[PDB]
Amino acid sequence: AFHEVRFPANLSFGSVGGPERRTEIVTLSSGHEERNSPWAHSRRHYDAGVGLRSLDDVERLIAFFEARGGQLHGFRWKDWAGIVSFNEPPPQGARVTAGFEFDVPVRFDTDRIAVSVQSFQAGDLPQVPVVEVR
């Protein structure tokens, strides 16, 4: 786990991700059913990041996966979407922030990455799914 950097600034339109709940469920064939969750939090589970810049940005991005990445390190993640609460219900969110200001430390959900060359200077990679491991 690191505190190294946010990320390269660029993120394409389509960087999807929202909280994932265990939601162990019984599905009684009669009808209504009960359920419970053991988290009391929610893995934010961000996906579909895309780096799009020149090839000068690519070599600092492919080794972003490699050098401080490996697989098992933090690289605090910037959300385009210290305790934050959500008060729009009479219930509450009350979800903690270990890092400051929406920085949600994560890890990539990939054994490999796949960077493409689309023109003399264009560097693209289609997806880097994360899950914000605590």
Partner 1 sequence: ATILLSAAGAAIGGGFGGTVLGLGRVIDQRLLGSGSQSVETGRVDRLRLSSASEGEAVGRLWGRMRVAGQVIWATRFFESASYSLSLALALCEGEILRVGRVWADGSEIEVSGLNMRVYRGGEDQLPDPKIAAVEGAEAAPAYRGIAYVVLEDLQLAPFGNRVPQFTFEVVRAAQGALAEAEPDLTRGLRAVALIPGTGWSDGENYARGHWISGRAVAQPLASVVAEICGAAGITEIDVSGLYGLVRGYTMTGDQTGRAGLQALMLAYGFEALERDGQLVFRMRDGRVAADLAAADLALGEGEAVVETVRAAEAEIAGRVRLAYVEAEGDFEVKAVEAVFPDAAAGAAAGSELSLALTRAQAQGIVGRWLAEARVARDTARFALPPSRGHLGTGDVVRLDLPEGKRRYRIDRVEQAGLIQVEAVRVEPGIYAPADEVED
Partner 2 sequence: PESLKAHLQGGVTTLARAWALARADGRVLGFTDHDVVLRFDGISFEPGSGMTAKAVLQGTGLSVDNTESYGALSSEAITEADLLAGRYDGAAVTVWLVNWADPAMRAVIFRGHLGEVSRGAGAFTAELRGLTAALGQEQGRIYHPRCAAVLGDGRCRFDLTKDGYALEAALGGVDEAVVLRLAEGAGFEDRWFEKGRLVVLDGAAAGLIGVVKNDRLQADGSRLIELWQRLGANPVAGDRVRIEPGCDKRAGTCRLKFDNFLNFRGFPHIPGEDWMVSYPVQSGTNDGGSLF
Please say whether the dihedral angle defined by the alpha carbons of residues 72, 85, 87 and 40, taken in this order, is positive or negative: positive
Please identify which residue in 7, 41, 78, 99 interacts with its own copies, judged by CB under 8 A: 41
Cα–Cα distance for residue pair 18/44, rounded to 1 Å: 5
Please identify which residue in 28, 72, 81, 114 interacts with partner 1, judged by CB under 8 A: 28
Cα–Cα distance for residue pair 81/74, rounded to 1 Å: 19
29 belongs to the binding site for partner 1 (CB under 8 A) = yes
57 belongs to the binding site for its own copies (CB under 8 A) = no
Please compute, for residue 28, the number of CA atoms within 13 A of its CA located in the half-sphere on the CB side: 6
Q: Which is nearer to partner 2, 10 or 71 (CB)?
A: 71
Q: Which is nearer to partner 1, 41 or 53 (CB)?
A: 41
